[PDB]
Amino acid sequence: KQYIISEELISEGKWVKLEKTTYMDPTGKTRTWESVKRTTRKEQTADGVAVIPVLQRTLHYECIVLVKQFRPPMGGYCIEFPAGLIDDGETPEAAALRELEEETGYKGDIAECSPAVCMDPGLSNCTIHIVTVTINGDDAENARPKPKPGDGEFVEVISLPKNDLLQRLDALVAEEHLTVDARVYSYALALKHAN
Amino acid sequence: KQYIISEELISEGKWVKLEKTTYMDPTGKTRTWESVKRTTRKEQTADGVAVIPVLQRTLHYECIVLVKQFRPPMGGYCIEFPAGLIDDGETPEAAALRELEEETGYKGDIAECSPAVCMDPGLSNCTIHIVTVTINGDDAENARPKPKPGDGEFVEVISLPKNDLLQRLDALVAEEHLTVDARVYSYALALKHAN
Ligand SMILES: Nc1ncnc2c1ncn2[C@@H]1O[C@H](COP(=O)(O)OP(=O)(O)OC[C@H]2O[C@H](O)[C@H](O)[C@@H]2O)[C@@H](O)[C@H]1O
Ligand SMILES: Nc1ncnc2c1ncn2[C@@H]1O[C@H](COP(=O)(O)OP(=O)(O)OC[C@H]2O[C@H](O)[C@H](O)[C@@H]2O)[C@@H](O)[C@H]1O
Ligand SMILES: [Mg+2]
Ligand SMILES: [Mg+2]
């Protein structure tokens, strides 16, 4: 019953724009909202993908591969699932394997993919596909993985035991000022709440 | 290694603002970034809280209480954990219990509270505390929950089986084309991966 009436551009940069949204509520009344949008968004599937990479090795606990990097908006370092924007004509799964191999050097296999999900719905229209990727750590292909980083990209690879993820994330946070991503934390929490 | 050099306000609304961030990368080179920030953030406190409401009943497996509402930035409806911005001086735990009761009518008990985690670090400095709350669904008091939304709030309550959360979320996305929150989905995936 609710829908968008109009979007008034407020300010637009090279990557992000801010606009005043006018919409109709359930009572037929008009209301406004301040919304954010990436200017690099196409009429594709989503702004990007986030990869949940599960490193598997026989006789070993599984490991979750994460990345640490400085995030200007946060003014500090953050612990996140590897992620990146998608390419035209590229499938979410294709981008996931590509982003994973580029940031971590690992070559994985698609386990499953999510529909487009929202990053922060009360603020922006940003969406991503969360792609679960398993990595055969016993394959020579993944013996010594080498990441292909671009210019201006300084990412650190951190692998943590999946069987104790939440506590291991807490331990990392106890060593220095670090912010764990909400999707990573939600994931770690569910692993404990499940069983 | 890396650090903020300055933050220049580009545009500012009543709720959201856009800034130009200048920072130094590892090589010593000055780079820039377009960052988003909420104008309502109190000092020394995350922007808000997301509540993971665990409905517990003697004759049933646990349920996760979620809410569905129209999100202007998304131009459509979203399925999320109950959430709200934190009032000044209000504890994350109190904001969570209050928000859950207001949006769903359930009175819960604190189980745990996470440190501040980021929503979308590549875009904004927004953070929240993920607060796990248990609800005694057999208490007469929770027999027929009645919410009490504030100014212009139209939120719908949707409780789903924790044991089959992922599948149940996919159905809703296909049946009504709406969008699931990335944290809700990340949580659902781990529940599945653990089981
Ligand atoms: N707001 C911005 N300001 C300046 N440059 C930007 C911005 N957004 C994107 N860019 C440029 O595009 C590049 C995209 O790099 P990716 O690795 O593909 O994307 P990433 O920054 O990791 O974002 C992927 C996801 O994570 C974050 O939560 C982000 O909001 C997105 O949802 C950035 O490194 C940068 O050069
Ligand atoms: N960007 C905005 N534009 C217009 N009004 C806003 C905005 N942000 C907040 N408000 C006003 O403040 C109110 C805050 O309501 P809450 O329930 O306390 O917060 P909510 O909007 O649910 O946000 C909490 C969290 O959940 C979402 O992921 C959102 O992005 C945020 O991180 C909104 O209903 C609205 O009136
Ligand atoms: Mg990246
Ligand atoms: Mg809310």
Side-chain angles (χ1 to χ4, degrees):
Chain A
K1 196 186 295 181
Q2 303 188 59
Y3 56 87
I4 303 310
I5 290 176
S6 68
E7 273 157 33
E8 198 207 315
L9 185 289
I10 295 182
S11 179
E12 172 168 40
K14 182 176 187 174
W15 306 93
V16 188
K17 65 171 152 186
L18 165 58
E19 72 194 26
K20 173 144 290 183
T21 304
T22 298
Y23 64 104
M24 187 71 68
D25 70 27
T27 63
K29 184 187 178 176
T30 262
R31 290 170 185 281
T32 67
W33 198 275
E34 274 165 33
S35 312
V36 172
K37 290 181 174 54
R38 281 182 169 288
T39 60
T40 59
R41 172 141 160 176
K42 293 77 182 184
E43 260 94 301
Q44 72 216 310
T45 165
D47 295 69
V49 300
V51 189
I52 296 186
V54 192
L55 183 55
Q56 309 179 308
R57 283 117 69 200
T58 187
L59 304 188
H60 297 240
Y61 290 106
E62 298 176 302
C63 290
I64 300 295
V65 189
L66 305 171
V67 292
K68 176 180 181 179
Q69 72 198 92
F70 182 77
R71 289 300 199 179
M74 287 292 300
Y77 292 74
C78 297
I79 297 298
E80 307 160 48
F81 279 132
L85 312 175
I86 307 179
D87 293 352
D88 285 306
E90 180 172 53
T91 180
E93 293 94 336
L97 300 183
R98 177 174 58 69
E99 187 64 14
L100 178 63
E101 172 159 25
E102 289 182 0
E103 291 189 347
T104 75
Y106 287 119
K107 308 219 214 314
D109 303 288
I110 294 295
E112 60 184 302
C113 181
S114 77
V117 295
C118 53
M119 290 301 281
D120 192 2
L123 182 84
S124 74
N125 69 332
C126 297
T127 64
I128 65 173
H129 280 279
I130 293 180
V131 187
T132 299
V133 178
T134 53
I135 306 169
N136 185 336
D138 295 315
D139 206 306
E141 190 177 56
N142 295 302
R144 49 182 239 146
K146 253 140 281 127
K148 260 68 179 183
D151 208 273
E153 218 171 13
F154 313 80
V155 183
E156 186 183 322
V157 188
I158 294 177
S159 294
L160 301 173
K162 169 183 169 182
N163 61 294
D164 193 39
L165 188 59
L166 193 63
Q167 294 72 202
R168 284 296 291 274
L169 286 167
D170 291 329
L172 279 188
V173 168
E175 285 164 48
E176 59 200 302
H177 173 49
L178 252 175
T179 301
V180 174
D181 180 73
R183 292 155 291 161
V184 174
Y185 198 91
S186 293
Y187 190 82
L189 255 189
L191 291 184
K192 174 175 68 175
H193 295 348
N195 51 192
Chain B
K1 191 61 168 295
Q2 302 187 58
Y3 52 80
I4 300 302
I5 283 167
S6 58
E7 293 168 348
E8 173 188 292
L9 188 164
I10 299 178
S11 181
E12 161 168 35
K14 173 168 150 56
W15 307 92
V16 185
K17 70 173 117 162
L18 185 54
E19 300 180 351
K20 174 180 183 174
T21 309
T22 304
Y23 65 95
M24 184 197 91
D25 72 33
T27 73
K29 172 129 232 305
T30 279
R31 288 179 185 270
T32 58
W33 202 270
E34 298 185 3
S35 311
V36 176
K37 288 182 167 67
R38 279 178 175 282
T39 63
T40 52
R41 189 188 186 122
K42 330 124 262 59
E43 295 199 309
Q44 294 153 268
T45 135
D47 293 282
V49 298
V51 189
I52 294 189
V54 186
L55 182 65
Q56 310 174 312
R57 301 129 77 197
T58 78
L59 314 182
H60 305 272
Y61 291 121
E62 308 182 320
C63 278
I64 300 303
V65 186
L66 306 171
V67 287
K68 169 163 61 185
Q69 72 201 85
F70 185 77
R71 287 298 198 175
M74 284 289 306
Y77 296 73
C78 299
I79 290 177
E80 316 158 45
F81 285 127
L85 301 178
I86 300 174
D87 282 340
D88 260 287
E90 183 180 58
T91 185
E93 286 93 340
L97 292 173
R98 168 183 63 58
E99 199 60 52
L100 172 60
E101 180 179 62
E102 292 187 348
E103 299 189 15
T104 78
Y106 285 122
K107 280 195 182 257
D109 309 287
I110 294 296
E112 29 175 342
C113 183
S114 78
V117 294
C118 52
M119 298 291 284
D120 193 356
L123 177 80
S124 72
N125 75 326
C126 298
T127 59
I128 60 167
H129 286 274
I130 293 175
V131 188
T132 303
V133 176
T134 56
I135 305 158
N136 183 328
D138 297 316
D139 199 283
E141 152 210 63
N142 287 309
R144 300 183 308 133
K146 345 89 163 161
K148 208 196 220 157
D151 274 340
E153 244 212 4
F154 308 94
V155 183
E156 166 157 298
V157 178
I158 298 182
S159 298
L160 304 172
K162 181 226 244 176
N163 285 7
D164 190 57
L165 188 57
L166 185 71
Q167 296 68 26
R168 290 298 288 283
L169 285 172
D170 287 340
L172 293 174
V173 172
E175 284 165 33
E176 9 225 291
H177 190 234
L178 75 155
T179 311
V180 175
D181 178 77
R183 289 148 298 149
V184 167
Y185 210 89
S186 292
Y187 188 81
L189 283 164
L191 292 178
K192 177 185 169 178
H193 297 354
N195 294 313

